Design a protein around this ligand. Sequence first.
Ligand SMILES: CCCCCCCCCCCCCCCCCC(=O)OC[C@H](COP(=O)([O-])OCC(O)COP(=O)([O-])OC[C@@H](COC(=O)CCCCCCCCCCCCCCCCC)OC(=O)CCCCCCCCCCCCCCCCC)OC(=O)CCCCCCCCCCCCCCCCC
Ligand SMILES: CCCCCCCC/C=C\CCCCCCCC(=O)OC[C@H](COP(=O)(O)OCCN)OC(=O)CCCCCCC/C=C/CCCCCCCC
Lengths: 418, 418, 182, 114, 77, 137
Amino acid sequence: QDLEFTKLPNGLVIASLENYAPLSRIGLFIKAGSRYEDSNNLGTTHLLRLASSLTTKGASSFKITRGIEAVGSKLSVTATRETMAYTVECLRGDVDILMEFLLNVTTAPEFRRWEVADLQPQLKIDKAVAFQNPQTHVIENLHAAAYRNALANPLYCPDYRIGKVTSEELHYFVQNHFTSARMALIGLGVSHPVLKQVAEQFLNMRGGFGLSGVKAKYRGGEIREQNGDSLVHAALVAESAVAGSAEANAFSVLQHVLGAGPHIKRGSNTTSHLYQAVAKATQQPFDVSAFNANYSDSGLFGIYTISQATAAGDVIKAAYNQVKTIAQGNLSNTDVQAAKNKLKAGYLMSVESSERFLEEVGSQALVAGSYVPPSTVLQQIDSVANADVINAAKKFVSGQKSMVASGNLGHTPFVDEL
Amino acid sequence: QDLEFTKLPNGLVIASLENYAPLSRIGLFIKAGSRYEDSNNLGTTHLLRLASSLTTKGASSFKITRGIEAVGSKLSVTATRETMAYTVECLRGDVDILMEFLLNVTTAPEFRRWEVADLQPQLKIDKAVAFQNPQTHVIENLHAAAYRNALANPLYCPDYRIGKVTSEELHYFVQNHFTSARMALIGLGVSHPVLKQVAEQFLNMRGGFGLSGVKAKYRGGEIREQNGDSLVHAALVAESAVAGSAEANAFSVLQHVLGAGPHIKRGSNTTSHLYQAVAKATQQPFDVSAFNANYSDSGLFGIYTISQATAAGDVIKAAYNQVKTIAQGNLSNTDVQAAKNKLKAGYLMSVESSERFLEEVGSQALVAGSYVPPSTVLQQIDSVANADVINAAKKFVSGQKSMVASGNLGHTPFVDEL
Amino acid sequence: RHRDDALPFAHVAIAVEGPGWASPDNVALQVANAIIGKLCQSFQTFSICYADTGLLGAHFVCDRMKIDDMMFVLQGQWMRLCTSATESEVARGKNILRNALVSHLDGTTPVCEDIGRSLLTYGRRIPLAEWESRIAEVDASVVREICSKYIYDQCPAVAGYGPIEQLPDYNRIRSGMFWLRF
Amino acid sequence: RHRDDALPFAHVAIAVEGPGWASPDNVALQVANAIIGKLCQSFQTFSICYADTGLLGAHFVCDRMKIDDMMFVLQGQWMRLCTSATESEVARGKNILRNALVSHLDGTTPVCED
Amino acid sequence: MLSVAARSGPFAPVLSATSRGVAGALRPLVQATVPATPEPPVLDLKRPFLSRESLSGQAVRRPLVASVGLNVPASVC
Amino acid sequence: TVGVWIDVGSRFETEKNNGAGYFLEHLAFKGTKNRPGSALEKEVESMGAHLNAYSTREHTAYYIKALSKDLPKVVELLGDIVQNCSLEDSQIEKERDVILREMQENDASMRDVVFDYLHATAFQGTPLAQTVEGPSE
Ligand SMILES: CCCCCCCCCCCCCCCCCC(=O)OC[C@H](COP(=O)([O-])OCC(O)COP(=O)([O-])OC[C@@H](COC(=O)CCCCCCCCCCCCCCCCC)OC(=O)CCCCCCCCCCCCCCCCC)OC(=O)CCCCCCCCCCCCCCCCC
Ligand SMILES: CCCCCCCC/C=C\CCCCCCCC(=O)OC[C@H](COP(=O)(O)OCCN)OC(=O)CCCCCCC/C=C/CCCCCCCC
């Protein structure tokens, strides 16, 4: 039994799949995120994802909270820089009322002054728990360094803005970006007729497109953060390719040739070129790997390292040189085939669970007219050559770099001397 | 009656001048400062200048404080990135005991754990009052952007280091940098024999030179700080010339041609090229001027602007273009002569008061073998040509820029697009 | 008790003895747990099963000045369930438990793991239908009975780490396991 | 009294009437000032002279919960000087005043102005 | 012109730093009352990673996703 | 996913060998006679598969994630691991140093600390009081 894409007169996309699972999942996906903010209203979207249980024109906050609890269900919100998603989980037969709640949360929110002003101090706390893992703030800085305007904007609220996001800003953002032609509704555990009954409530919502935004412009930046930590984290990237491109597949295979992450518990990663290169430059604990992001109008590829403070310069260099040898065309059929194996297998494992499967389908529904089954993805992977991988490596080596580093930087190098 | 330079067998320099003033001033000057710190002991010198009344081997803290108060005198400490100075002011006849205090503060400090640990929380407060004026933190960032290692180090303690500067660090720094061959003692209101009696107590102190440090290396940096302020501050510089150089005189005259600061209360600054250029690009309140620093092994020259947030791009450009026209050799005898007038007059006014006169003499004593009287300075100014000024402008226009900006940067340009 | 007044926050764990893998009562207990789970940053309830025994209790983190209140609140909820439970909350707990059971078994790895653990502990795979039938039988009377059977007037095991000066004395904790008005 | 509970800190000024430019007493008063000038962030004493009158008093900034104590301390020092002064402190004040007078007249501008 | 003050003009008070020690006889300008910054949230201490086996897999391979739920902890990819 | 689950854990160890299972877990994937050294690791990584293990107060487990096409190899490897580990002295000493280093510094979360303390006080004088890792001694 298969998926069925469809588009309503409003431009809203709907799709569903009646897998005979005891738990039904419904996702509403929206083209919104931090890239549509500007310097005058930064942090709006963070508070927006936290505000997903304030009162609405259709149901009281108390009602929403207790009613969702009383059946055991959940309502999550997830964002990226480019998309936002509201997801509902429920047992079979619970749909209807939860769908009323979804509708009121997305199409008819109230942003009462006092509730917003009581919700503000939680931004600080949420950002703090996020910023306990060091990787997050490094990647945040990398986007700021890499881009001048749009993908640069932060996922978490700026500190100077906490306590000074207003109700009017929330209203304006929702009115200008939560529009029916930016939307898709996806249902697993649900028959198309039933999902049509659900989508029927969305027929009189805000129509057309919204404010389209600006295109991202590249920066050759560099950001350094000095702390006392004995371990230093570093990221070094260039610009690679757009989402859903053959060249992006080339870059993916390159990532998996260099090394994307571990496979054996407590292993030595003998298959990984970057790890084996670095292991000969330092004798204390390190970590290294390769990095890929892709967007609607840009993408980044590079390396990510963690090392002792006095060893950084040796590590970062040892990693970089490895990539260069591939650019010069030291690359082997055996490595390439193994990389494609890693990639096909990792992809198929990433979508065992319904949660991630729903995400993937919803991502496709916002950007393509038809669903691409995994077999087609596997073939597209199969179709990358060695020359494509070497060309990708040459692109990285030649193009203008961006860099971030955090720690005790007494021996970290500067981007100009790599 | 004239100054008398002299050097002891230790290498200590001493100079004095018996002006018949009721108030005597004595300064001890030292080659020390933040440029001799490294990433492992940042902030040491800040706490060092605040610790100038903790107990010593020769006198109790209570004794130092009350004894200085009981005669009405003062003991100041002043630093830069390259030098530190301890200065004493007193009525005639008070010298001897205050000189004992000076000796114990500089040659025999105790850094008792509990007193240091009670003194720590004042770093935060001092830095806060300093950082109320916005210019200070912008200039601090400019040095970080402009240099990789040494002149980059901050004058005020890093936040992550407050509460974690230790007594051992203070002891080590003093032992390795407060050395007799790095020192001069200067006295106004004091007869050379008396200043010899004073310097006699310094004969058995730490001898020779210390740790010499590292040479500063230039960075083509850029630092951006985003706030909500409606006014944006900006600085744009390049590398110019070393302290005490003919080329530095050229750069000074250039600064005064462009505009160094106001002369009439509530005036229009019709003589100022930068101000008149900018006044035609914006109709709301702005400020602009030219910027000079010089060091032992480097120097910076550039422009400094304050404007509305939406006008920044127009202001910064309008300023920059002005300099370029001088590089192309639109420069007039009349402007040059007027600039040299401003410069000679400003210099002579800067040394009316004994406080600044002492500073100037002490600065010379650390770097030259003989005192240079103002007449010689005025002649050196008189000796700059038009071609030197135009060459300096060309150096600025051609060389690699560094930039800092702070405010709401939605319209500020990036260093690459100027 | 391990005292260290330099750590930011106090960690605390308190259990009684649970019945083990084999007993039926586990189901009802889980429902109870779901009913219980502000003062402090973080809080949880737990059941840890072994072949013939187990631990049934709670874990939390507090600021050092708010340990006593939190212990009071927790033990009060226990006494409440033992003496005064009602149908409306029990229903909610049963629904939470249903959702948990079905949410866990998503993807091959958890399912494989469930097969292995089940064949070691139970001797047999227990299908979701049997779990649903077991859940449907619980009611407020069952909760009252079984909570009384394992929690009420029992001696607990306590562990604390941190700035734990304000963690109540053991006699004060033991006296909190029963009500004088009952 | 102008009340605004949104401002961070409280500002306060309290004077009595001073004698004016012409009187001799000014000198002694200045000494007193130097003797007086912790609780709060900032504090000062002042004398403001006119032809026939003047203001003699003090100014300070406090956190809102520490205004009362500070007023108590200030008025207590005043009463102390009126009733119980001693030679040792007076000497210190005279020296502070000497230093101020000679420090001010440095450079042409202040001298012209004087 | 070898002191900062004689050379730099109106930028001297930002190119130089000073602390006037025990209180003096005259009263300075720009007294500067201090509304200091508030304290951030307090958190548990960090664990070290002093082995390769503990650092293995910490390096980033893909950009991040931000998540929250009404009855689930907030999370980051 | 395919694995082997084993009815063994820390509550079957005596104070003389408390900590043996964790030791064995450290060098489970380090080589077999048929696949010396890193050959096993390289063959797992060339399939694109993942390999994991764990150890508990009462159970032990080793499993593999893979493509369904690879079942004959998977089981093969899985049988090679549980019958034919090469317990070489060099590897034993390397694991000894690693575990000691891993115990030296305070590399434990406070939650784990309090739960270990709870088991110790509740089940004192009984095998369940003892930890999976065991003492450093
Ligand atoms: C004199 C010499 C002096 C010097 C001597 C020197 C040496 C001294 C050394 C020793 C010093 C000791 C110091 C004191 C230590 C105190 C410790 C302590 O407080 O621990 C806190 C202890 C620790 O727990 P926690 O951590 O705080 O947790 C709190 C939880 O809520 C816990 O919840 P819980 O449910 O577990 O417990 C709550 C409940 C637990 O208690 C119960 O539920 C019942 C307990 C047993 C039954 C007692 C019933 C008494 C009823 C009143 C009298 C009538 C009796 C019948 C006759 C009717 C006549 C008409 O208790 C209460 O709620 C408190 C009140 C209980 C009685 C209810 C009546 C209240 C009104 C009293 C006045 C009535 C006057 C009119 C009477 C009628 C007309 C004549 O918890 C308590 O709350 C303990 C309660 C202690 C109550 C004592 C009551 C004594 C008064 C009785 C009545 C007297 C008047 C009689 C008049 C004549 C008619 C008969
Ligand atoms: C007159 C001559 C008598 C000579 C004989 C000896 C006299 C002295 C004997 C001891 C008297 C003690 C009186 C004080 C109460 C002591 C209570 C005690 O030790 O037990 C503590 C215990 C507290 O419980 P915890 O476990 O700590 O907390 C549980 C929380 N979930 O006390 C209790 O039981 C409190 C509840 C009330 C108990 C009854 C109090 C006394 C009154 C009861 C009878 C009422 C009628 C009185 C009529 C008097 C004549 C008009």
